[PDB]
Amino acid sequence: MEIVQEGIAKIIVPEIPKTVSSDMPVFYNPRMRVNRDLAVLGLEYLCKKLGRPVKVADPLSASGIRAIRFLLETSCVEKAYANDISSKAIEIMKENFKLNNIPEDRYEIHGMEANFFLRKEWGFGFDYVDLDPFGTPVPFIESVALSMKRGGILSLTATDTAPLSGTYPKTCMRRYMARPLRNEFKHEVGIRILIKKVIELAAQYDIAMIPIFAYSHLHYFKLFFVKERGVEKVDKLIEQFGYIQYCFNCMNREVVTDLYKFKEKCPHCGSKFHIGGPLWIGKLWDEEFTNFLYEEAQKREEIEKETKRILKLIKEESQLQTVGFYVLSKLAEKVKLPAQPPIRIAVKFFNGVRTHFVGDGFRTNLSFEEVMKKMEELKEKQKEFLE
Amino acid sequence: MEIVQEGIAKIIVPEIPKTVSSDMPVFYNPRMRVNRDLAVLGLEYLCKKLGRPVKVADPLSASGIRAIRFLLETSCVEKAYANDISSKAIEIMKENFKLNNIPEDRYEIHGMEANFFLRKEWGFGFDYVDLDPFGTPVPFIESVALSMKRGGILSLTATDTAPLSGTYPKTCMRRYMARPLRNEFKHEVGIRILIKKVIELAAQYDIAMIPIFAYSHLHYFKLFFVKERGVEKVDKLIEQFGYIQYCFNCMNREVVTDLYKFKEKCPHCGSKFHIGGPLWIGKLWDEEFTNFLYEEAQKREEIEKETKRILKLIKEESQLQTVGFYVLSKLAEKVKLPAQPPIRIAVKFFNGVRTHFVGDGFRTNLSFEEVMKKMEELKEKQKEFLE
Numbered sequence: 178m179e180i181v182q183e184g185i186a187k188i189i190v191p192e193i194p195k196t197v198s199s200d201m202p203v204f205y206n207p208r209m210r211v212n213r214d215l216a217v218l219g220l221e222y223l224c225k226k227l228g229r230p231v232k233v234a235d236p237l238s239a240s241g242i243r244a245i246r247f248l249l250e251t252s253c254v255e256k257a258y259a260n261d262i263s264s265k266a267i268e269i270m271k272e273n274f275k276l277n278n279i280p281e282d283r284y285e286i287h288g289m290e291a292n293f294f295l296r297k298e299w300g301f302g303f304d305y306v307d308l309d310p311f312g313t314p315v316p317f318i319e320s321v322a323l324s325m326k327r328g329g330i331l332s333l334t335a336t337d338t339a340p341l342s343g344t345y346p347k348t349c350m351r352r353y354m355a356r357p358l359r360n361e362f363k364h365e366v367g368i369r370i371l372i373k374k375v376i377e378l379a380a381q382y383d384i385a386m387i388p389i390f391a392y393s394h395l396h397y398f399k400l401f402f403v404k405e406r407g408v409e410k411v412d413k414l415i416e417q418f419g420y421i422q423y424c425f426n427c428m429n430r431e432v433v434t435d436l437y438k439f440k441e442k443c444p445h446c447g448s449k450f451h452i453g454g455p456l457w458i459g460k461l462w463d464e465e466f467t468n469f470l471y472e473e474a475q476k477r478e479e480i481e482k483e484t485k486r487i488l489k490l491i492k493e494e495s496q497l498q499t500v501g502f503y504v505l506s507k508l509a510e511k512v513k514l515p516a517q518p519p520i521r522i523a524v525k526f527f528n529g530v531r532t533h534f535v536g537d538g539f540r541t542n543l544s545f546e547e548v549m550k551k552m553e554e555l556k557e558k559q560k561e562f563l564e
Numbered sequence: 565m566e567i568v569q570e571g572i573a574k575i576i577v578p579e580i581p582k583t584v585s586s587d588m589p590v591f592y593n594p595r596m597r598v599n600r601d602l603a604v605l606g607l608e609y610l611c612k613k614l615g616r617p618v619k620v621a622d623p624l625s626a627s628g629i630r631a632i633r634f635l636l637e638t639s640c641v642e643k644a645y646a647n648d649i650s651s652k653a654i655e656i657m658k659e660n661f662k663l664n665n666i667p668e669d670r671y672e673i674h675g676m677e678a679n680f681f682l683r684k685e686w687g688f689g690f691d692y693v694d695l696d697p698f699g700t701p702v703p704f705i706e707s708v709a710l711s712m713k714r715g716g717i718l719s720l721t722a723t724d725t726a727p728l729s730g731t732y733p734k735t736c737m738r739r740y741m742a743r744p745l746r747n748e749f750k751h752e753v754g755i756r757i758l759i760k761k762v763i764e765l766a767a768q769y770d771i772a773m774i775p776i777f778a779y780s781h782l783h784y785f786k787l788f789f790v791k792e793r794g795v796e797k798v799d800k801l802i803e804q805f806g807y808i809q810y811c812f813n814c815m816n817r818e819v820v821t822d823l824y825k826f827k828e829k830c831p832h833c834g835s836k837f838h839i840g841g842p843l844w845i846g847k848l849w850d851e852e853f854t855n856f857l858y859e860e861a862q863k864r865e866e867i868e869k870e871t872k873r874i875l876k877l878i879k880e881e882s883q884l885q886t887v888g889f890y891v892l893s894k895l896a897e898k899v900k901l902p903a904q905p906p907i908r909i910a911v912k913f914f915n916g917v918r919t920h921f922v923g924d925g926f927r928t929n930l931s932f933e934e935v936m937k938k939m940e941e942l943k944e945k946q947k948e949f950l951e
């Protein structure tokens with residue numbers, strides 16, 4: 178119905194509405210461009226790390242765009258295995274591979290349910306898997322983990338951000354077995370819950386799925402994991418499950434890994450100290466992986482400018498990783514600050530860094546009390562020097 | 565190699581060792597007789613409840629004994645679907661169906677991996693599934709839940725009792741995401757952990773798998789679940805997840821569902837108050853289902869006498885359901901009781917009932933302090949009337 182270009186790929190896709198959401202359930206959504214850019218960069222990383230030809234899986238392929246961009250824009254793909262349960266998805270996919278002049282022996286197209294596709298007796302494990310569902314990836318996690326080769330990377334998307342972010346808490350509990358927190362850093366809480374779920378499902382088979390990258394945008398989450406083996410590595414991951422206590426009155430927060438250590442009342446203002454989790458309380462970014470993504474992205478003209486800006490922000494963010502973050506406007510509303518300095522400047526007063534999660538958000542190693550003290554010191558010297 | 569009879573069935577099986585464990589990994593284990601008796605009784609229950617022909621699944625069939633006994637010893641099986649990934653398992657299974665003169669249109673034999681077998685596009689859901697693995701059932705739970713019809717019953721076995729019972733705690737955590745308790749009621753803790761795992765895996769798909777029967781013997785667990793639909797029912801199940809605090813010094817125990825409520829020290833003796841769970845803190849037995857099993861068992865000559873005795877004990881036990889139980893010998897060792905009355909008599913002093921879990925174990929609604937008080941009152945009137 179319509180021809181579009183993304184990166185080096187050209188594809189035929191049904192016409193899409195004048196405007197779409199980031200998680201729009203259409204055959205091809207151009208707003209997922211950043212997502213696919215990241216997936217391509219993540220694969221190139223593996224190309225450079227393994228230094229050999231890899232086999233990649235695209236179990237939920239639709240137009241075939243991801244598999245195609247993998248083949249066209251990375252150096253090491255021996256063969257791409259694309260799949261979709263939808264028959265017309267398949268037809269379109271076929272024509273799209275041909276449209277990009279991709280040799281037949283470079284790919285396989287299948288029309289199976291994704292779990293069956295992944296669990297086929299291939300005789301080999303996948304080095305790279307991109308799992309890109311509408312909604313939750315939960316139903317496919319185990320099959321992906323089992324199908325992947327040791328040291329392989331998973332490119333993952335989830336669009337069920339509403340439950341994970343606290344809009345629908347009972348729904349979140351049913352699917353992820355965790356209590357969410359609908360606060361100023363709700364998207365981070367959501368991502369950490371998702372990570373926990375991925376890890377525990379793989380852990381059932383003594384597979385260690387280590388998170389190495391996180392990205393939140395509007396109504397989707399983007400994660401990367403690397404698969405490893407050994408019960409000790411699984412154990413290490415599990416040890417980094419925990420909870421976040423958070424106060425809606427004053428925004429105080431605290432990480433708890435010791436079940437004996439929960440506090441009913443917020444030590445700051447005495448309001449109810451809510452509990453979020455259990456969830457991943459470890460790092461959201463592997464420094465080296467993240468740095469590579471950024472550097473490699475900059476060498477590619479076919480990578481969106483936005484992806485490059487986001488990666489630069491995430492690089493900065495990855496150097497001061499914390500559980501949760503602060504939002505300047507909300508702190509300001511709390512202490513009535515005369516004027517809010519631009520976030521780039523604001524973070525400096527807190528020895529912090531910007532976060533991609535929210536425009537005026539920031540991470541810091543300072544304690545909550547210290548942060549509030551800084552909010553008072555500022556405002557105090559703002560008012561004093563105001564004459 | 566050898567012909568054996570179990571119930572009404574006659575089967576050919578490889579010769580087995582002079583002696584075997586309850587969980588012996590052989591083609592056919594006669595020590596699982598009680599397990600299979602229960603499975604047959606559970607199916608007849610469904611026969612009487614639905615009053616129509618049912619389709620049953622035996623995804624891990626081996627000799628075919630369960631499917632065969634279902635067909636021969638119950639009234640309502642329209643068709644049995646048996647499966648095993650092992651080729652010689654298949655050969656044997658075929659001959660066994662013929663040996664029992666079962667009409668061809670009454671069964672189907674498949675040689676697939678059990679998850680693929682279960683997830684086949686059958687065009688119908690299974691009314692009854694018997695899942696009988698060596699070790700953990702975890703890898704098959706989701707496929708079973710999805711394949712089952714609403715209102716269908718699951719007959720489940722697990723033989724990985726060592727991790728669940730606290731012998732291997734890190735292994736338990738990896739597979740079940742729970743801390744076990746290697747105490748006097750360790751097998752109950754293990755079962756409640758297993759139940760929790762089953763529920764949460766089904767919950768991922770908004771399926772409510774309600775436990776209705778539990779049985780622990782030596783090195784295996786036997787559970788029954790019924791499948792239901794509706795997020796509210798799933799919610800109800802999740803609400804019955806919780807923890808058990810237990811003291812190894814004095815055997816004090818307490819159920820905690822409120823994360824804020826954990827105590828570091830045992831309120832009785834001040835020793836460390838350990839935490840087990842999260843796990844199922846609800847009922848282990850549906851009264852009606854359990855009663856039926858017992859009554860129906862008594863009408864069947866081909867049902868083991870042992871199964872009948874066990875069911876009678878469980879019937880008694882199901883009328884006073886508690887989280888955890890006490891073991892007389894261990895309490896006695898604690899307070900040095902002159903003589904331990906037979907458990908049948910002992911339970912009366914505690915307003916309790918016997919438990920099938922352990923010979924001299926008992927359940928009671930009395931608090932720990934009350935139990936200990938009874939241990940002191942007894943011993944006191946034992947010594948006073950000793951002259």
Ligand SMILES: Nc1ncnc2c1ncn2[C@@H]1O[C@H](C[C@@H](N)CC[C@H](N)C(=O)O)[C@@H](O)[C@H]1O
Pocket residue numbers: 204205206209213236237238239240241242243260261262263266289290291292309310311
């Ligand atoms: N269970 C399933 N098995 C296989 N394919 C599925 C299944 N469920 C959904 N799909 C396909 O899943 C695809 C999901 C899409 N979000 C894929 C998007 C694609 N990766 C892109 O970047 O454009 C749809 O094309 C569905 O047809």
Ligand SMILES: Nc1ncnc2c1ncn2[C@@H]1O[C@H](C[C@@H](N)CC[C@H](N)C(=O)O)[C@@H](O)[C@H]1O
Pocket residue numbers: 591592593596600623624625626627628629630647648649650653676677678679696697698
């Ligand atoms: N993944 C699998 N898919 C299908 N069959 C399997 C799988 N793993 C193990 N099996 C078969 O699982 C069976 C497990 C047995 N414990 C079955 C016992 C049988 N239910 C009985 O009562 O005698 C073995 O016969 C294996 O061949």
Ligand SMILES: [Zn+2]
Pocket residue numbers: 424425426427428429443444445446447448
């Ligand atoms: Zn507060």
Ligand SMILES: [Zn+2]
Pocket residue numbers: 811812813814815816830831832833834835
């Ligand atoms: Zn104690």
